[PDB]
Amino acid sequence: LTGTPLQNSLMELWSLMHFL
């Protein structure tokens, strides 16, 4: 559950997706 947009870092996006 996230309240902020995932536009800060492709590395953060990849981490969140791999965790998903």
Add this chain to the structure above:
Amino acid sequence: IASTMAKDVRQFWSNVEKVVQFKQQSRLEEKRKKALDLHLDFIVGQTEKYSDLLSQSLNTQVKTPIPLLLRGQLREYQHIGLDWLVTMYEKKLNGILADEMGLGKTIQTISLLAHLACEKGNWGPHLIIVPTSVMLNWEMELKRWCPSFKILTYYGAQKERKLKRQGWTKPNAFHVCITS
């Protein structure tokens, strides 16, 4: 004189090896670049294929009603998100809810749990990891909307945590755990 000569030549060949290292780094970056771009199309294509496969079974119109465990009504967008989460669960995918703050993501997750409990018979041990500032808020929202879940707030000193963990492995000891 010959040691000065050797030092000069060693510095020169260190520069030469630096040029060679620049070359090899340029070649690796290419491999890094194509490797990054190649797997991107792979992970993206796979994710999009799984989502398209997921949206294929939608009837779109919401199929899930307000489960019996809810004591109040759900908003329109909340009900749509509940149906989407139920579809994600039925098709065995994990979810990311990016609704703006204040739209009741807590209520949406609680309604998802209500559906899983009523229609699927799964009231698991459902772990919920939240900031320490909202543990009480989540507990109160659960007690308010879904009163049938056994809530276990994991807080306190080590001794209190050990006391709470004593016998927590037994079945049906708790349904939803809330930790930080």
Add this chain to the structure above:
Amino acid sequence: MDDDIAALVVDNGSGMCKAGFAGDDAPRAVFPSIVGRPRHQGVMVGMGQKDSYVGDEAQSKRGILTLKYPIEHGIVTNWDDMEKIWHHTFYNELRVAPEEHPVLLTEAPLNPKANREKMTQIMFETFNTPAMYVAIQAVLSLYASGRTTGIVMDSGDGVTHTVPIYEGYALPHAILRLDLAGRDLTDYLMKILTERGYSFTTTAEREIVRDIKEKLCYVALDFEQEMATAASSSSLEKSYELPDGQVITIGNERFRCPEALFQPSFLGMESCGIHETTFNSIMKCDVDIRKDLYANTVLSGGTTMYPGIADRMQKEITALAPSTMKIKIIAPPERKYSVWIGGSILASLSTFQQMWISKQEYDESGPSIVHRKCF
């Protein structure tokens, strides 16, 4: 000194002068080291009567000029002719003023102290060079190869030298010399061609035979097997067109001539071959450095341009050296210019600016300053 003034580099082998600027990838001029003088007065009426000719200008007029080589076996024997060659290099080949550029001259190992002092005097008094330096050919070849530890087998046109170097330390006690080079190889080629039936007796035909040597000769990996193949088949023969259009056939001579570098017995010299000389030098060297001397065996000189010479040296040094020593022969494609390449590298390096012999140091310490500043 202005940092924008590039220094000059001059490599004077027994048969070739290579002159260029510091920082360039190849010498700008490469001309034969010879001085020609008219044989008879009045033969040049209308073409310009010069008291002497140098380089290709004399090579082309060899038919009417008596030619002399001021460098014999890597040692200068005619200082007047050497001054003439340097003048031709500076004012005709490079077309520059030597008093405006430093000069890094290459010399063979064990160069006489008198010769070094005379070179310094000529450079500081005749050409008025602002500064100069003298470098060893083998050390420059090693630096061009890009190393400071290893053994360099530099075979020019008049002499061959096996020079071991450790961290730039050209070890005098271990340097070995051999009076066998391209000149003696050309003589041997003339001899074997006369034996085969092609008689060359004039100095001009000597150049044709030298060209045949440079073009068709090669080092064989197994001399006995190559001789057997040449005797049992003609596949090893080649055709060569003379300036008059006659096509001659060169057979086993192609590899019998360069074989003299490994077996001087063919020429009648009671001396070990180049591989045995390199091995003996590595032996004379300290045991702790023999591993690196083997691993960094470098080839240099025009005579080392024969195809297969590197493989033959590899084979021989691996058969002669202990089984625990990893042998590696280094033969750069441009090894014929490694001397000048290393000279230019050392002259362009900034840290080398403190090594030059300045006009002030010369005027203060006499020509002997070479024995203190050049090593």
